[PDB]
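During the second year of the project, the team shifted from modelling isolated chains to modelling whole assemblies. The rationale, set out in the original proposal, was that interfaces cannot be judged from single-chain predictions alone. As a representative example for this report, we include one of the complexes processed in the last quarter. Its constituent sequences, exactly as entered into the pipeline, are reproduced here:
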Amino acid sequence: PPAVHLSNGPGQEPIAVMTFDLTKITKTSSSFEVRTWDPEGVIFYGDTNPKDDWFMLGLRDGRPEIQLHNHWAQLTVGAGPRLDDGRWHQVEVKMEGDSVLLEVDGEEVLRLRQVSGPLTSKHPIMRIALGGLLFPASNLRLPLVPALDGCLRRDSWLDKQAEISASAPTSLRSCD
Amino acid sequence: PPAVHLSNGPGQEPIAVMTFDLTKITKTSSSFEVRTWDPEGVIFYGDTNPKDDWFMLGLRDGRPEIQLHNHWAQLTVGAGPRLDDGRWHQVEVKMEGDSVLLEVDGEEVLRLRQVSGPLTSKHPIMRIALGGLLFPASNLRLPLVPALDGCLRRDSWLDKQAEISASAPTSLRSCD
Ligand SMILES: C[C@]12CC[C@H](O)C[C@@H]1CC[C@@H]1[C@@H]2CC[C@]2(C)[C@H](O)CC[C@@H]12
Ligand SMILES: C[C@]12CC[C@H](O)C[C@@H]1CC[C@@H]1[C@@H]2CC[C@]2(C)[C@H](O)CC[C@@H]12
Ligand SMILES: [Ca+2]
Ligand SMILES: [Ca+2]
Ligand SMILES: [Zn+2]
Ligand SMILES: [Zn+2]
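Output from the structure prediction step:
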């Protein structure tokens, strides 16, 4: 399976940004495998508005951390086992009703309830950035250093049929 | 080890309530072992004010759930493995800086960050209720049925030297 580097050297910007049409979304889940020895960094960021409608999934002290900021909730939460053990880990992030669910290696490790209304409704465009944020780290509810020295593979983001475009500030590097 | 029943039949009220002097608190952690086959219910509730300063640790679909409502945060979060497997489980809830940490069987499974300022400061009295709430379940951010058919043992609550009093609406029942 082709795996890409989650950061390009300095690691101050995402390695890729995908834009989606929310009205066209039929699938809200995202999944991928990640491998790393890095205990802190951004795995992926998502927003409909960088100002007041955003989400971040990363690692802090080796464990998953989600920061979320929207009309219904504002939170900084850590959960799950350490993932900075150099092994491949399966990760899934999905919407289940008004909740955001995080599954690690097939097991649910965190369910953030009552945090969102329907995506398609309410913010017609959603952006997903890998390995970086779309705003300064200092703007996070709880700052961390975004650079994540790890590998990503077998990734699936939301609904491909709803993807408007994809960019890369530079060029994706292989973990081979 | 003497174990007590976490609910008395109907299970509409706590089996015990302990009151503490916050200014006297030197230890903020609580720990205990719980065993149960019940997938939903309140393990313990805590507040400094039932109106706007409260906390609840329970089970929903077999897994730990924390609801918290205070000046800094308002949340409903599920985490950790199922605990309704009839085995004894060690549980710890503690303050670590501005965070509330939940450990299950020796492993950190959830860290709610940026949710509280110093306890001793800011609410001079804290109440801890076991197996029930100190307000209607309908008043929870996300209602659940409080009755938890399980056993509790080896419990330690905050700082005993700060305990003002303890009550029991009825009488503690043994799991023997
Ligand atoms: C987590 C998820 C959904 C599952 C999907 O796999 C990834 C996206 C990323 C953006 C989140 C959204 C959930 C709703 C959020 C928190 C708000 O609307 C602001 C940003 C949004
Ligand atoms: C969780 C803990 C601390 C660890 C201890 O072991 C149990 C107590 C229960 C009451 C919580 C408090 C944390 C601060 C809370 C959320 C707010 O002040 C309102 C109720 C309070
Ligand atoms: Ca890093
Ligand atoms: Ca029950
Ligand atoms: Zn919005
Ligand atoms: Zn208060």
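The interface with chain A takes residues 63, 73-81, 107-114, 141-142 of chain B (CB under 8 Å). Chain B has one domain: 1-176.
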